[PDB]
C-alpha cells in the first residue's frame, strides 16, 4: 500500500516474458507480472496476450496502493511491447514516462550461438 502518488515500474521484457514487479526507483516492489504464471503455456508463452492479461493482473488492487501513473522502463523486445502497457493506458492508467532502454553494448564479450 503505503499510499503514494506515482512510481517507477521497471519492466524486464524478455523474448518470453515481460517480467515486471511494480517496483520503484528506491526498490519498493509489490506487484508482480509473469507471462507463465498467468497461465498461457504451450505456444502462448511468447504471445502478447499472455503479457496483457498479466499486466492487468499486475495493476490489480493498486488503487488501494495509491499508485495511478507509473514510470514504465521496458527492457527488451517483449511479447506484447505495444499493448501490455497500452491497455493499462486504454483502461485509464496513464504513464509518466516510457523509457525503452535497449541495452546496446559496443559488441564486447562474445555472444552465444543457439539456433545452429
Amino acid at each position: 500500500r503505503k499510499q503514494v502518488s506515482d512510481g517507477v515500474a521497471h519492466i524486464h521484457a524478455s523474448f518470453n516474458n515481460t517480467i515486471v514487479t511494480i517496483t520503484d526507483r528506491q526498490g519498493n516492489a509489490l506487484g508482480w507480472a509473469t507471462a507463465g504464471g498467468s497461465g498461457f503455456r504451450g505456444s502462448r508463452k511468447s504471445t502478447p496476450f499472455a503479457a496483457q492479461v498479466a499486466a492487468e493482473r499486475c495493476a490489480d488492487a493498486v488503487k488501494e496502493y495509491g499508485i495511478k501513473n507509473l514510470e514504465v522502463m521496458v527492457k527488451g523486445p517483449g511479447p506484447g511491447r505495444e499493448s501490455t502497457i497500452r491497455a493499462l493506458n486504454a483502461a485509464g492508467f496513464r504513464i509518466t514516462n516510457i523509457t525503452d532502454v535497449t541495452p546496446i553494448p559496443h559488441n564486447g564479450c562474445r555472444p552465444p550461438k543457439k539456433r545452429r
Partner: protein, 65 residues
C-alpha cells in the same frame, strides 16, 4: 549535397560545437553519409570528432543516464 571544401572551406573539429552536433541523432547514431551527402574524407573527420568529444563529454556513449 551541401557546400564543401572546394567552395565552403570548413574545419571539421570537435571544438566547434555547432557542426559537431549537426550530424548526430537521439538514437545514439552518427548520421551516415548515405542521406546527408557529405564527402568521405571529411566524413572520416566527421567520424573522428564524435569519438573525440565522446571523451570530452560533449556527447555520451549512450543516451539514457
Amino acid at each position: 549535397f551541401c557546400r564543401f571544401t572546394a567552395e565552403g572551406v570548413q574545419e571539421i573539429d570537435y571544438k566547434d560545437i555547432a557542426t559537431l552536433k549537426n550530424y548526430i541523432t537521439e538514437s545514439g547514431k552518427i548520421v551516415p553519409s548515405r542521406i546527408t551527402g557529405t564527402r568521405a574524407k571529411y566524413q572520416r573527420q566527421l567520424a573522428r570528432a564524435i569519438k573525440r568529444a565522446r571523451y570530452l563529454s560533449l556527447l555520451p556513449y549512450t543516451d539514457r543516464h
